[model samples]
Each structure stands twice: as C-alpha cells, then as structure tokens.
Target: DLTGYLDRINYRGATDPTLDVLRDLVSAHTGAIAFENLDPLMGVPVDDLSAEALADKLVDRRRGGYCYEHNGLIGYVLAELGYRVRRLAGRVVWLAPPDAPTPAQTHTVLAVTFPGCQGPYLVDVGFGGMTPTAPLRLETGTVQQTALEPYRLDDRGDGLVLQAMVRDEWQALYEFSTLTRPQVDLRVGSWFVSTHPTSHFVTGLMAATVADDARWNLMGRNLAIHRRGGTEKILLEDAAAVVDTLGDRFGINVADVGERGRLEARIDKVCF
Candidate 1:
C-alpha cells in the first residue's frame, strides 16, 4: 500500500516518518490527487470510509474525491508510515450564511505528529479550492503561511476556528476540536454531504487541485485559476465540457466515475 500510494503521488523522496518527510508527502498528495464530489453528485453514497476504498478510488482508478476520501486516505497512509495521526471533523462556514443555524460537521481533517520532536500539526489535503498545501502547526492565533494562503486558528465557543487570509482579509473557513472522531461519524457526514436533497454536493459541481504555484477550481462550468496576483475565470461550454475539464485538468477518469447515462445526466442537471 505504501508503494502504491507513493507511486500514485509520484513521490520518490525520503520515506522516514519525520516532519520534513510529512511536508513532502502533503505537498505531493495535495498536488496529485484532486478534491472532487463526483460520487456525491453522481447519486452514489460514499458509504465506505476505509483506506482501501479511498486508495482504490483516488490512486488505483485515478479518480478524485471530497474531504472524507482525501483525509481518510492520507491519514491511513501516514499512520502506516509511523506518524501519529488523529482523525477529526468540522463544520464548514467559509461561505455559509453567517447568522444561519449551525452547519453540519462534515469536513474531515487530520492532526499529525511525526518523530524528531514535532508536535501535532494540522493536515488537511481536501478542502477543495482553499486547502492548505502544507501541514500547519496546531497552535492557535499564529498566522501560518502555507504554499498559498496564510492561515490562523482561534478558539471559539463552538470549536477551533480555522481562518485563511485571502486578499488581505482573514476569512473563516471551518471550526472543530481535538475530539477524535470515529469512522462512523465520517461515514454519516459523507452520506449526508453526498446524498442530502439540498446539499451543495447534490446541487452543483466542485473540483479543485493545488499545484506548486497555483490553484485550479471548477465550480459548475466556471474554471477559475488562482495565481499570485489575480484569478482567471473561464466559463466552460456545458456539462460535457466540464467533464472534459475534470479529466484533462483534475486527473479524473470520467468513465470510471459511473455509468455514462447517469453521470452525464446528473452532471448536466447539477452543473447547468
């Protein structure tokens, strides 16, 4: 499994479970495997949170997935490599109504600590367009500059708030605590996120990847490329075009996603 994951990510760096090695692995994994919701949008329930399932989809089939699949996979891989890994979940508040009722804790992240005197670090390779490309220190209030945006965590009444500085403003992304979550919780959250009637995953398309120098985000038919200075947004032609972009840019094999009729229809309905 280690060789399979490393091969999938094209990583040939140091394999020892250290902070430096963890950084390299996060960089490789985030850059290689994208964040997508095709299974959710394709009307399939993400029932399995097992590492083997995650690897089969993300590595073997060359497909991408949302937070549960992404973090679930990497957490397992890190544990296997001798890193101390803890699973956690959180509620998404990045773009939700500020005064609305509390959102579901559906987002998954990992707290990782490796050998050589490193404390636990926040590692989330699956927050889509805003994912921190590198592992962040678990301490709060300190602004941690990642490969892209700078992030800072703060304790709130609900939980630890993870905020990112975008366009010179700190934006609240999600909130969570260190309470270790079980696999059932992630599975339930994934079920709701992927199948709920009004959920965004069921209503639209979102696919994103973090590269060394940029972020590629696809929302519906719009493909937004975020570079240093500004973002370039391009509206794709249609559902088929969006699928092509997913395969071409995000490294997903559309054919392996599901049956053609259902997948296209679902994408067309949600994307258009």
Candidate 2:
C-alpha cells in the first residue's frame, strides 16, 4: 500500500518504535523531498488534501511536492502505523534568526499522540530541510539536540520560542502559540508559501537542513555540508552529490534525483 510510496520515494532503511521510525523518516524523506513550487508555476491547480485528490496525485504522477504533501503524506503513514496523528500548522521561522520577526506564514507539520500518552508530539518530517532526527519532546523551556542540529524552546511570556544552534550558538528560529495551529489554518498558509512571490521555494533553488547535528544544504549551484566546525563545499560538481549526500547520509534515494545529475559537478567545485 503506502509502503509502496515509501519505496517509490526511497524512504527505506530503518523502522523502529513508531516514534523512532517517524523520526528517521522525517530526517530522511524531508531533505530528499523536492520543495519545488512547480504546480503554481505550471498552471496546474493545487488541490486540497482531500483523500481522493491526494491519492490521485500520489499514484498517477511523478512530481516534487512541497511542505504539505511532504509532511501530510508522512503523517498519514504514521497514522497507518497506529500512531494517532494530526496535521498541524505552523509559521516557518527556521530560516529567520532569533532577532528577526516570527513569520506568520502558513506551514504544515505533524502531531502524533502515542498510545497511553496524554498529548501529541509536534512531529515534522517535511519542513523543506534539516527537520529533526527525532521528535521534539513537547515540554517547554528545554533544549533537544538531534543528529544534525540542536533545538530548544522557551516560554516567551506570550508564545513559545523555538531555537536552533547555529555557529555553535543558540539561534531563535521562531515563536509559536500552540493554541492556533488547526489543520485548516495551514491550508491558507500552504497556499501562500507555494504561490507567494518572495517565498523561498518560489525564489532560487534553496534547501537547508540540520541532520545528526550536521548541516547539509543546496542553494542554486552551491552545496555545503558541515559538522563539528568542519565544513565542506562543492560547487556544481555533478550536483548529483546532493542526491548522493541525501542517500548516503540520510538514506533517501530516488529516481527524480537523476534529474539533478546535470548540476551536480558544478556545485561540487564551489560548495563550502
């Protein structure tokens, strides 16, 4: 069934306890998921996540999906695994530093309530790049570090602060109020992100993520991977390295990656 989708998308390699399995999936599939805003650009109607439409889109075509499709599909799979999952919306503040304003843009994430648990975990496997290797513990004022990066949350009097470590320092990614994240709310937000002119996906080819406390990203022709203060960059060398890096490091390998082979070598020469 959907496991077929997993295989089709190259999301195989590890499956643990429900949460552990999801953590791995999020880390792997998200970075590998194409965050292209192609539909809007191609004049195709971006359909809602109604079951029939989503199924049609999944099985009938070969296209890169954005946050909604990426995170939404994973959420469905998690539910199939017996985890009580919900689709939640959030503002993407990951690219915005702490001092920057928390963006109110619409974005989607997953929420999972494990058996015997009173609350759900804010799980996200698709937030474009470098999501989390494990689900963040829902507790506030705590810091959690996954394989690729460190994440922390604080009680900011009004909302909660979500921060990640950058340059060996804690950087604020955004502030969120757990009260206003309905799934429907995210649809409008998703529409904006997928269609807005200044949206990152609509702009240049940019994808950045932190995995296992290591960073790997691609912006146009630059490919950068770093860990422990040691960094490497490849500028347009068989841009296939991006695919290889995703497969080798995150266990995400798929056919669409071949499309990037044309740009791989170029990024290899200049990645830093």
Candidate 3:
C-alpha cells in the first residue's frame, strides 16, 4: 500500500489534504526519492507507467526514475490521499536551443487544490537537477520561496510559465496551459523520452537528489554538488567508480550484478 511510499520518503506527517501537509510531504519526497534514468539507460521499457507499476518499481523496489516515474508516482499518492489533482503537460525548454521550435509536451506537472487554499499550486517533483523542493503557488507575479531557490509564475496570455531565480536572474523552465492530459498522453510521452534517438534521457547519464543544504547531480561521468556557497564537480574514473557512486552518493542499488555491469557499460560508452 501507500504506507511503503510514506516510509520510502520518510514522511511521518499528516495525510490530510491540507496545504501544510502537501508542502511537508513534497519536501520530504524530493529529498528521499532521487531522480535517475536507470531504466532508460539499462534498456528497460518505460511504456507501462501506470500508478501501480510506478509504485512497484519506485517505492517497492527502491529505485529512482526520471520525470515520468517521479511525478507519476507522486500524482498517484496525492490522489489517493483525497486531494484534488489534475495532470498537466508542459513543453521542456530548460536546455533547448534558444531558436529551436517549441519542444514536445513531454513533461508532467500537477495542478493541485486544497479545501481552503486560495490558489492551485503548481506541483512537480520530477524536473531532475533543478527539481523544486517545494510547491510554487500558481498566482502570477508572486515570488515563492522554496528549499533551494526562488520561483515565480507568470501569465503568458494563453498559459502559465514557471521561472527560477538562477545566478540572480530569472530563467524559464517550462510552459504549461490549463489543458488537462490523460494518463495515456503522459505514457506516450514517457515512451518517446525513453526510446527516442535524440531524447536526452536516452543518451546521457542523469541523476539528482536533494539534501538539507545541497543538491547532487550526475551527468555522464561528472557528478556535481550544488550548494548555496558554491558548486563542486567530480569525474568518475571507471565503471567501478560509477557503480559505487550510484550506491553511495545517489542511494541507488542494483541487485543484479549483471545489470550493474550493463549500466556501467552504458555509462562508459556515453562518458568516453
């Protein structure tokens, strides 16, 4: 049941559908559940992203996943907790080319409303490296303080866009409208993201997790730890080091030694 999920996130708080509860739960989740592309990198099919499947892999199996798995699991938990949740799709613009066309609507975020909250909050726990540690209120022009950085939402005529305060400047992350998407839509998006030749998730080694005072990320062989004071990067020398780092630093463990070898081989091919 969801009790395993609560334990996975170390969330021992209230389960009621209140703003305070939501905030606390999300904060714990981001820290406990890491963001990783293990399945995609290991050639596992991500086509079955149903809530039950997601829970079995993420919660029960103690593995991390990318956006689809992360947000998919969280969305399921919130719904089961009696909250009003709507699945929304967004075009990823975080690292896209400046002049590139609008990207596909592959990212997932949630519009969640509580009984007494003034506005629906834009909730996402799956944005990888820059994943918000807290929910951003959907009110336009309001700066919301999160555990890592400050964010503000803006009204862009037809939709809402989320921006993050990075290096003293606001940077656009992704854009989404009020349009609601069904589970099938996100499932298709997840398949494309995992299998598409040009998809970043298919070509790179990406993982992230939050801590009390820092955020740790792995891209290729470089592992970066970003903190308020500064950022630190380390390069893994070989496959053995990669496996050790995944377990020690990112809290991921592969039970099958053969699978670990495959993952290391995948990283080696991409990193070098």
- TM-score on alpha carbons, each prediction: 0.96, 0.71, 0.96
Write candidate 1's Cα lDDT for 1-272 as tens digits. 88999999999998888888889999999999989998878778788989888888888899999999989999999999899999998999996556978888889999988777457899999899899988999888798988788899998885698999877678899989888998888899999998999999888899999777899999999899998888899988877778788888998888897666777677787777
Candidate 3 residue pairs in clash (backbone atoms < 3 Å): none
**Candidate 3 regions off by >4 Å?**
256-258
Ranking by lDDT: 1, 3, 2
In terms of lDDT, model 2 sits at 0.59
Clashes found in each candidate (C-alpha, N, C closer than 3 A): 0, 38, 0
Residues 85-178 of candidate 3: C-alpha lDDT, one tens digit per residue: 8999888777555587988988899989888888888889999988888877878998987878889888866998888887667888988887
lDDT, candidate 2, 146-220, per-residue tens: 766778777876656667777767766545566636666667776776667776555445555554456666665
Better structure of 2 and 3 per lDDT: 3
- How would you order the candidates by TM-score, starting with the best? 1, 3, 2
The global Cα lDDT (0 to 1) of model 3 is: 0.84
How far residue 84's Cα lies from its native spot in candidate 3, in Å, is 0.5
lDDT (Cα) of model 1: 0.88
